[PDB]
Amino acid sequence: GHSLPFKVVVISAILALVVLTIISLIILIMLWQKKPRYE
Amino acid sequence: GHSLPFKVVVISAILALVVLTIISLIILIMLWQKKPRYE
């Protein structure tokens, strides 16, 4: 666009979005076996 | 990047890296104190 190509920007954004779900997944199951959940 | 502006990509990426660390910090302190804190 002005300096760096959108190529690196996109790949970086998408990936960062994926890891957020991964790191969150660990917490979900972790707490799932600690404090019971109410349905 | 053939539709939406490149701006949203950059902001989303940088923001994703910031929150990623925060997600990890919550687990660290959570396990550091084990039991929740009240009052």
Side-chain angles (χ1 to χ4, degrees), chain A residues 9 13, chain B residues 4-15:
Chain A
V9 195
Chain B
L4 304 175
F6 77 120
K7 184 159 62 182
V8 303
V9 200
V10 185
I11 303 172
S12 180
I14 183 63
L15 180 66

Side-chain angles (χ1 to χ4, degrees), chain B residues 9-27:
Chain B
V9 200
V10 185
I11 303 172
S12 180
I14 183 63
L15 180 66
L17 273 298
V18 175
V19 298
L20 179 64
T21 303
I22 298 174
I23 299 298
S24 175
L25 291 172
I26 299 174
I27 319 167

